[PDB]
Design a protein around this ligand. Structure first.
Ligand SMILES: [Zn+2]
Ligand SMILES: [Zn+2]
Ligand SMILES: [Zn+2]
Ligand SMILES: [Zn+2]
Lengths: 374, 374
């Protein structure tokens, strides 16, 4: 009954930088060929949406942010074959065109048809499917999840298990997959190993879960916030050290505990200094260090190349290294299996009209994760 | 007839820093348990021996440098089982104890019983087997190859094919294995791939040979010395670019030629800037960059962590990543097979008494490789 025409719903529009979201009434055009229209059930509030707000992550304004969510398909345009109206889904911030140099590469996952490198804030056709009173509103990463309805290209959507709690699995859209995959697919943690995770936030907790799934024998969780240590242990950290309690550099305290250094270290905070530190606390001969995120406004770090000469590996990734369309479905399946748990991460569920409030919880504080329900 | 007592031979002793080598008469004590005495047939002159001279690579003086050579066993001490008097060998700058955390690791190769990290300039027992007129002379990396006779621990020696041209295979002791292995074992180049090698010197030429053995489909050789380009092509480079001819940064010219960037890049010069450049000219989503060497006096490089975030890998290694004792024997076997050639690298053969002259050829110039014969 909306199957073939415009929709009128409320979306959180960012007109200007450093301005709160504006609950507005916008019209959502019907999906063109290979586009899919989804009715949002829940969306998480991720750090990267706040960067849009600061002007740190530069993308065309006004826009409709959000990228970590789950929904239900309302209508699909011409040529769509992967989803059907009524199907559960998760929109993908990192596409899967399935045909670029990267999609075909057995390891690569940063699909070339992504809108994060040189942001356009459009659909693959270069047009916006949103208007606010005659004014065109830009998309955010082919997602725009801070809307009751959104349109996404077919390469930016994944069909998941129909019995999926969408108020929980929305995590698989960013936060969880990003940390989880960093462990299991980027570092490729091995059983019996020792790992160090710098930052015990939500992505942080997801890395620990990965390291655990992977089979690590020890997981040192490091944060300067004692308070964050309980969940970490509950989720899998075997130990937790507060760099603030030692009279010496933790790379040292860390190299001493692991007797030589850890097998894998994770810098999940995005700090430059911490990036180097984690590189160092790693076994000099065969240690692997993974950078989970770096603020979009990061500067150059200072390092001694000698750190790599001994035998260390330094890696990075977007979306936990997962081939998005192939993998999302699988993470739900594993969750449905009772494999991993997602609850420990959800610290707040607010109705969607209270967005800006969610952002406050995020901005100055302890909010592991805030889920917005529609 | 020397089988169980001191020997008197000539060695190149470095008494002081920034002083030429002194052809001297020194006595070589007989091998203790698990030590082996070797009669040198030839030794290459490697860049790292000159660092000892500048004071850049800090090791106890006076010392007997050299570490890239081949010889014949004269006597073996108690408990030796791997070599027998008369056997061809290659002394190993990077040991193989076979029992440290690193020897047991399937990838690690930087044996923990190495003398490069915290140089002692002794034997595993902490004693020197050299004296010059009553004065003790230090060892260099468990090797000291600038001597007619040397003593090495059993973990620092490899037995090779008895039909081996030792005036050619001495290369497998440093120079060749270092570049070769960087390709075939550290980057683990794959067939059909595109590679970029920064620096067309000897290790440089060995990386190109590796990339070729490995099966690359394209090999861009980069150097600011047009003159070095012929051997590179002869040895395997499909193309050669001189950064000096473009009006733009080669990371760009390079990203444009490889249409996205190379699969693997090698920084074989040891320059900080070049280190970053090679990181960048690599496919953002799945490109691997390998650092073959860094001067022992290197400073911190400046970099944007964002380079790794997309999906790139940054690695380093000592001795081409090869498990020394296991591998050396195999590189001779492959050479004996007609697999790879070593000649193109040997640009100079000088009798050993003319050491300092070899160092001149090295120091200011084009000398791919200088082999010293005893
Ligand atoms: Zn693609
Ligand atoms: Zn996110
Ligand atoms: Zn060892
Ligand atoms: Zn060398």
């Amino acid at each position: 009954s909306t199957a073939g025409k415009v929709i009128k719903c409320k979306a959180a529009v960012l007109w200007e930088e450093k301005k709160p979201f504006s609950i507005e009434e916008v019209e959502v055009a019907p999906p063109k060929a290979h586009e899919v229209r989804i009715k949002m059930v829940a969306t998480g509030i991720c750090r990267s949406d706040d960067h849009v707000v600061s002007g740190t992550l530069v993308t065309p304004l006004p826009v409709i942010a959000g990228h970590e969510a789950a929904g239900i398909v309302e209508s699909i345009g011409e040529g769509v074959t992967t989803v059907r109206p009524g199907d559960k889904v998760i929109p993908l911030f990192t596409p899967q065109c399935g045909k670029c140099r990267v999609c075909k590469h057995p390891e690569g996952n940063f699909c070339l048809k992504n809108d994060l490198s040189m942001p356009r804030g459009t659909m693959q056709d270069g047009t916006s499917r949103f208007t606010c009173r005659g004014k065109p509103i830009h998309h955010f990463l082919g997602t725009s999840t801070f809307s009751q309805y959104t349109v996404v290209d077919e390469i930016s959507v994944a069909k998941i298990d129909a019995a999926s709690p969408l108020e929980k699995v929305c995590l698989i859209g960013c936060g969880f997959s990003t940390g989880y995959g960093s462990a299991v697919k980027v570092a490729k943690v091995t059983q019996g190993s020792t790992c160090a995770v710098f930052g015990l936030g939500g992505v942080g907790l997801s890395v620990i879960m990965g390291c655990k799934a992977a089979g690590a024998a020890r997981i040192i969780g490091v944060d300067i916030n004692k308070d964050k240590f309980a969940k970490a242990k509950e989720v899998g950290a075997t130990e937790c050290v507060n760099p603030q309690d030692y009279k010496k550099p933790i790379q040292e305290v860390l190299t001493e505990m692991s007797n030589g250094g850890v097998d894998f270290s994770f810098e999940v905070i995005g700090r430059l200094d911490t990036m180097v530190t984690a590189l160092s606390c790693c076994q000099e001969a065969y240690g692997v260090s993974v950078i989970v995120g770096v603020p979009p406004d990061s500067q150059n770090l200072s390092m001694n190349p000698m750190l790599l000469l001994s035998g260390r590996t330094w890696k990075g990734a977007i979306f936990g290294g997962f081939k998005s369309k192939d993998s999302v479905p699988k993470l739900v399946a594993d969750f449905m299996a009772k494999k991993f748990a997602l609850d420990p991460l959800i610290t707040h569920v607010l109705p969607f009209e209270k967005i800006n409030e969610g952002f406050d919880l995020l901005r100055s504080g302890e909010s592991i994760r805030t889920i917005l329900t529609f």
